[PDB]
From a paper:
The 14-3-3 proteins, including all isoforms, belong to a single family with structural similarity and are thought to function as homo- or heterodimers.
The crystal structure of the St14f free form was determined at 2.5 Å. In contrast, the conformations of the C-terminal helices H and I showed significant differences. In addition, helices H and I of all three chains show high B-factors, particularly helix I, suggesting conformational flexibility. In the St14f crystal, the solvent content of ~ 69% is larger than the typical value of 43%25,26, and thus, the contribution of the crystal packing seems smaller than the typical case. The average B-factor of all helices A to G was 61 Å2, whereas the average B-factors of helices H and I were 73 and 98 Å2, respectively, suggesting that helices H and I are more flexible than other helices.
Numbering used by the authors:
A (entry chain A), B (entry chain A): 1 to 233
Amino acid sequence: MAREENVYMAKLAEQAERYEEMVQFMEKVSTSLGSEELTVEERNLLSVAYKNVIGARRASWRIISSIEQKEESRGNEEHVKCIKEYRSKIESELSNICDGILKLLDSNLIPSASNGDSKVFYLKMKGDYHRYLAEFKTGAERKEAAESTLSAYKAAQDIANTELAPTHPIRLGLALNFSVFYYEILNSPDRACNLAKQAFDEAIAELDTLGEESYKDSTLIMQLLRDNLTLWT
Amino acid sequence: MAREENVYMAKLAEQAERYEEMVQFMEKVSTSLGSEELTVEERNLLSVAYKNVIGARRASWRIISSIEQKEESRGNEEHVKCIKEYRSKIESELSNICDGILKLLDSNLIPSASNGDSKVFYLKMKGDYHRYLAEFKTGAERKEAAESTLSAYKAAQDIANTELAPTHPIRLGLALNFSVFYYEILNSPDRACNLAKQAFDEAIAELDTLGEESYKDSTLIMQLLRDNLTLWT
């Protein structure tokens, strides 16, 4: 049967801003496939869905962490005990969300990507979500997450380097996250700045062969890489 | 024991924008009382909580209804069947949210309000939430909701008229919702415009006895009543 229906429901879920439902709908598109790949449209929806569901918990996690620290500085110890419990609950959510998208990548989407844009897309996403585990996980789970990120970003760059134009927003967007993760989580500015400037230089080397729709895609990203290189200096 | 804790958790829930949790926390404050009333702070949190939880479903309901109608006009009948199912689900949520706050008003907060500001506050809220049932319920449930609203708004105005200054933001805010409900749901512009201009005129009759904190409260509302009277003409 046709489940353009679940795709149509996911676009309604998006319009309604009911993102948890958007995820369940795109998870139903993905776990119903035999040999078929998600279209671009479909993989983009799955990604908008997870990005909005994880975004909201990341933002809760950041305000709850600021409060946790302001109250720790003031010696308000009953508050801290309460904030910690709340942070713990949000961490539980964050960790199950990451596990849901990782499980779908590891066992449906990555093993069935054929084109290279697809392989880079799913391997980047896998990295993106291990990076999110790494922002809050602790101990050995933080270490396994930082390594899973690096190794997914690397396997993605290997394929992006050969099989995708230097100007492709997947390859540029992979460069942006990879460069930021080297700097912010591995504390390696040399590397961060390097593959940033590499991704930028390479992509102006062929910027003189895009459309008026192809441009707005990768120009947005190219400018993000640029303001970081000047920032990072 | 002290459950300033649940109040503190509700303020964390608000900061995190986890409003469903804010509701559960303020519901726990309210269902734990013996003879005690919610403070102003507490009744305001309960209200911020329910307002954000119902706001998000009302907004989903409005975009899903616009889509439902655009697709009905274009003859896209598979879409409509899908949109209707989605609208139905959002209606289920809206109806259980309204029932939760109504159950807490009808059986904890209204029967124990002592001061009059408190009685007007809970009776207004009861009206506010029956008004929301009336926006989407259908048939006899819509009729029982429109009447429950009217009768809660009336019982509230009876008390606001004697026991609260004409300038009190509860009494003015009650006037705003009451006036809007007469116009938009009962289709009675004469009445809408009347008790709007009455609430405004009466409140400038004593506007020359407020603070610099008391003012910003009821001026915001007084200007809302004013732009409607000119609009409604």
